Amino acid sequence: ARTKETA
Amino acid sequence: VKPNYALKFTLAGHTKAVSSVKFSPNGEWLASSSADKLIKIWGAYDGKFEKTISGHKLGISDVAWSSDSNLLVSASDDKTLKIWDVSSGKCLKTLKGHSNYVFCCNFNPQSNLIVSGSFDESVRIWDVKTGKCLKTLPAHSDPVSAVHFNRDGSLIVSSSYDGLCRIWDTASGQCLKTLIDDDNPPVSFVKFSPNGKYILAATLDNTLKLWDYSKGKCLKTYTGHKNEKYCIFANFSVTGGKWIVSGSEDNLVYIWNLQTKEIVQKLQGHTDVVISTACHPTENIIASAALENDKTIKLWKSDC
Ligand SMILES: *NCCc1c[nH]c2ccc(O)cc12
C-alpha cells in the first residue's frame, strides 16, 4: 500500500 | 498574511500506517484509510471517533467521499475497490477488474462514476450503481499514483511513476494531453484546482507544480519540503488565505502562499512521514496523517 510503496 | 494553524486533536486508532484522510463535502466527518485494512470515521470538528468500516482483505491506499457525503470508495492492495454506505457501514459493491494493487480513487462530481488507478498501469471508470467496469484506459507504462475528475466530470487527470500526467476524455477515453516538464521524475500525486483551471502535481524530486493544463504551462513551483519516496497528497486550502498544503518526509506539514510560493507555516508534531493532508470545506481546519512509526491523525485549526 501507499504507506510503504516506493517507485 | 500567514495562517496560525495550532494542534487541536490527535486521533489514535489505526494499528498500522495511515494512508489517506479526506473531509466529507458536508464538513461533518473525516474518513481515514490505513495499511491495517480499515476505514475509520471521525468527527471533523472534535476528532471524536465515530466508527470502523471493514471488509478489505489487504491494506488500503486511498478513500474518497461521494459529493452528497453518503458514500465512500476505497482502493486496496486486494486489487478491488469497495463502495460503502457510510451511515449503514454496508459494502454496496466490490469493483473487480484491476490485475494489480489499486492505489487511488475518486468519484466524479455527480458521483455516478468512480475512477481508479492501479499498479497494473491502467485507469478504470466504473458505474457506481451497478459496480461494473465501463472503460479500461491503457493510461501509463508504470503504476498510476493518482486519478481525479475535473469540475464538470468531462475530464480525468492521471499521474504515474512513468513521469507523465495525462488528461483523458471521460466519454471517449481518448488521451487529450500529456504533461511533463524539463526533467522526468516519477509523478506521485495530481488533482484539479477547485475552479478546474489548473492541475497541482507532485513529483519525487521534492517539488509541487501548478499547471494550466489547457495551455500545458507550469505557472507555479512550490519547494522547501522533502518528497523523494512516498505518494504524498497535496491540497488547495480555500476557506481563508489561498494556500497549498502538503505532507513531507521530514515529518512536517508545509503550507505555501499559492500566489507568492513562499512557505507561510510548517506544522510540527508527527513522529513519521506525513503521507496525507486534507482541508475542511468551510472551516480553517487541516487533517494530517503519518506513517508506521506514528499511526496518528492530527487536526490543526487557524483563525485565517
Ligand atoms: N510499490 C511497490 C514497488 C513497485 C514499483 N513499481 C511496481 C510495479 C508493479 C509492482 O507489482 C510493484 C511495483
Centre of ligand 1 from the C-alpha of residue A7, in Å: 7
Q: How many CB pairs under 8 A join A and B?
A: 45
Q: Which residues of B260-280 are buried (b: 16+ CB within 10 A; e: fewer)?
A: eeebbbebebbebbbbbbbbb
Asked whether the beta carbons of residue A2 and residue B62 sit closer than 8 angstroms, the reply is yes
Nearest CA to CA, how far is A3 from chain B (Å)?
A: 6
Please report where in the chains the cell 492505489 appears, as a residue.
B103
CB of B253 closer than 8 Å to CB of B289? no
Grid coordinates given for B143:
503504476
CB contact under 8 A, A3 and B34: yes
CB within 6 Å of ligand 1 — which residues? A 5-7; B 100, 119, 143
Q: Find the DSSP H helices in chain B.
A: none
- In angstroms, the CA B79 to CA B163 distance is 23
Side chain identity, residue B181: D
Element (H, E) at B124: strand B123-127
B230/A6 touch (CB, cutoff 8 Å), yes or no: yes
Q: Return the domain boundaries, chain B.
A: 1-304
Residue B63: how many other CB atoms lie within 10 Å: 26
Resolution in angstrom units: 1.6
Measure in Å the smallest separation between the Cα of B187 and chain A Cα atoms.
10
User: How many whole angstroms separate alpha carbon B25 and alpha carbon B21?
Assistant: 13
Render A1-7 in DSSP notation, one character per residue: -TTT---
User: At B56, is the secondary structure helix, strand, or coil?
Assistant: coil
Question: How far is ligand 1, taken at its centre, from the CA of residue B59, in Å?
Answer: 15
Any idea what the Cα angle at residue B241 is, between residues B206 and B28, rounded to 5°? 95
Experimental method: X-ray
* Residue nearest ligand 1's atom 6 by CA: A7
Q: At which residue does the C-alpha cell 475542511 appear?
A: B280
Mutation target among B15, B18, B19, B203 for the A interface, most CBs of A within 10 A: B19
Task: Provide, as residue numbers in chain B, all residues whose Cβ is less than 8 Å from the Cβ of A7.
Answer: 142-143, 161, 186, 204
Question: What gap in Å lies between CA B13 and CA B48, rounded to an integer?
Answer: 11
In 3D, which of B8, B65, B7 has the Cα closest to residue B31?
A: B65
Using alpha carbons, select from B104, B94, B24, B91 the residue that is nearest to residue B54.
Answer: B91
Distance B89 CA to ligand 1 centre (A): 31
At a CB cut-off of 8 Å and minimum separation 6, what does B23 contact? B29, B30, B44, B65, B278, B279, B280, B281, B285, B287
Q: Using the beta-carbon criterion (under 8 Å), do A5 and B230 form an inter-chain contact?
A: yes
Whether residue A1 and residue B77 make contact (CB cut-off 8 A), yes or no, is: yes
CA dist B13 and B21 (Å) reads 13
Contacts of B239 (CB under 8 A, 6+ apart): B279, B280, B281, B282, B283, B284, B285
User: At B53, which amino acid appears?
Assistant: I
Phi, psi of B274, rounded to the nearest 5 degrees: -90, 105
The H or E element containing residue B107 is: strand B102-107
Q: Which of B235, B199, B204, B202 is nearest to B217 (CA)?
A: B199
* 3-class SS of residue B244: strand
Closest approach of B144 to chain A, Cα-based (Å): 11
Please compute Rg for chain A using Cα positions.
5
> Residue B256 half-sphere exposure, CB side, CA atoms within 13 Å?
24
Each residue of B72-103: b (16+ CB within 10 Å) or e?
A: bbbbbbbbbbbbbebeeeebebebebbeebbb
Closest CB from A2, A6, A7 relative to B61? A2
Half-sphere exposure of residue B162: CA atoms within 13 angstroms, side-chain side: 21
Q: Residue B85: which residues within 8 A CB-CB, separation 6 or more?
A: B70, B71, B92
CA-based radius of gyration for chain B: 17
Kindly list the strands in the beta sheet with B49-54, ordered across the sheet, starting from the edge strand earlier in the chain: B18-23, B29-34, B38-43, B49-54
